Amino acid sequence: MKLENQLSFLLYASSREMTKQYKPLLDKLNITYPQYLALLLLWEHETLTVKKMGEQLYLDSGTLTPMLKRMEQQGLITRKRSEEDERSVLISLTEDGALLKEKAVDIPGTILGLSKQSGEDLKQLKSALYTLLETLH
Amino acid sequence: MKLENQLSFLLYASSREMTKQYKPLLDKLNITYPQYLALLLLWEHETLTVKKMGEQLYLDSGTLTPMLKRMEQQGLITRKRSEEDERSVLISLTEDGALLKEKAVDIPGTILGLSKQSGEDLKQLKSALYTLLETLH
Numbered sequence: 669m670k671l672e673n674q675l676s677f678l679l680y681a682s683s684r685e686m687t688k689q690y691k692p693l694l695d696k697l698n699i700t701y702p703q704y705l706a707l708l709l710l711w712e713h714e715t716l717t718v719k720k721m722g723e724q725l726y727l728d729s730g731t732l733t734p735m736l737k738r739m740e741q742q743g744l745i746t747r748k749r750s751e752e753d754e755r756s757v758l759i760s761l762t763e764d765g766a767l768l769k770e771k772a773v774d775i776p777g778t779i780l781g782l783s784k785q786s787g788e789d790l791k792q793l794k795s796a797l798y799t800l801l802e803t804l805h
Numbered sequence: 806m807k808l809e810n811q812l813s814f815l816l817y818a819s820s821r822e823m824t825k826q827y828k829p830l831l832d833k834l835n836i837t838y839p840q841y842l843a844l845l846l847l848w849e850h851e852t853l854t855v856k857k858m859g860e861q862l863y864l865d866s867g868t869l870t871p872m873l874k875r876m877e878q879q880g881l882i883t884r885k886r887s888e889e890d891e892r893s894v895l896i897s898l899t900e901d902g903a904l905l906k907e908k909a910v911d912i913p914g915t916i917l918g919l920s921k922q923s924g925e926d927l928k929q930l931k932s933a934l935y936t937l938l939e940t941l942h
Contacts, residue, residue: 669906669913671845671861675920675927676823678934683816684863685941690813708808724808726821769806776806783812784940789933790812796930797815803921804822 679797689782693775697768698742702727702735704772710745710761711769717750718757744768816934826919830912834905835879839864839872841909847882847898848906854887855894881905 671677690701699707705725709716722732736759739745744765750756780790808814827838836844842862846853859869873896876882881902887893917927 669845669910670849671842672935673931674842674845674913675917675931675934676820676827677842678931678938679816679820679823681863682934682938682941683813683820685938686813686816689941705808705811705814708806708811712807726818773806776811780812783937785937793930793933793937794810794812794815796926797812797819798809800920800922800930801815801819801822804819804826 686779686783689779690775693778697771700735702731703739703744704775706735706739707744707765707768707772710759710765711772715758715760718759721759739765823916823920826916827912830915834908837872839868840876840881841912843872843876844881844902844905844909847896847902848909852895852897855896858896876902 687701690704694700694704697704702725706721709721709725718732718736721727722729727735736745736747740747742764743762746760746762748758748760750758783790785793824838827841831837831841834841839862843858846858846862855869855873858864859866864872873882873884877884879901880899883897883899885895885897887895920927922930
């Protein structure tokens with residue numbers, strides 16, 4: 669029952685350690701970590717309701733609103749009450765937010781190399797984590 | 806650059822999903838998740854300063870104090886200003902906190918079986934996560 673033999677703790681700790689590995693690369697784009705993840709969601713789907721936005725990202729309305737608020741100011745996104753259902757809000761990407769992808773494309777390779785983990789070890793780690801994540805859903 | 810191809814996000818998400826898998830088993834002991842981790846640290850080291858306590862657990866003074874406060878009330882721990890250095894605080898375990906280990910010993914096997922992940926797949930997942938965690942340190 670050692671703390672470090674618990675898979676739940678191992679996932680979370682590694683989570684913290686990996687994240688901090690971004691500050692250096694993201695400080696240049698001004699972006700923070702959560703904003704970076706939201707951006708990866710947006711360069712992929714262009715438009716998303718706020719429900720799904722926090723849904724797949726695990727972010728509470730408390731740390732979701734200030735984030736978008738800053739992105740809007742930066743001109744990375746744009747809100748819009750849904751006309752199909754006023755009860756929801758859509759978040760679209762601006763051509764400024766889309767052109768920002770040009771200089772992020774290399775962040776992944778960099779950080780993956782900064783983790784000192786290489787080869788298929790990372791490919792299997794990821795593969796297993798996705799399966800696990802899919803299972804618990 | 807898909808969000809789900811990012812190892813940092815995969816670690817965190819899986820982290821959330823795994824954790825929620827505790828509520829059922831911990832609600833019986835009254836313990837919450839963070840308190841459970843602290844308990845695993847304590848059934849292992851008996852006494853720890855507050856610095857190391859949050860150090861290896863990644864918990865901020867904000868979510869660390871209320872936790873101990875509740876454990877003390879439950880009679881699971883006991884504080885004590887360090888006599889060797891008044892500038893630190895030691896957290897010891899009570900015989901009530903130590904006898905609580907009797908009914909937690911099975912929580913791990915249960916949850917590990919609730920993750921539907923089995924065999925050496927879990928042993929290697931863990932092994933790799935610890936190595937990664939050690940690397941980023």
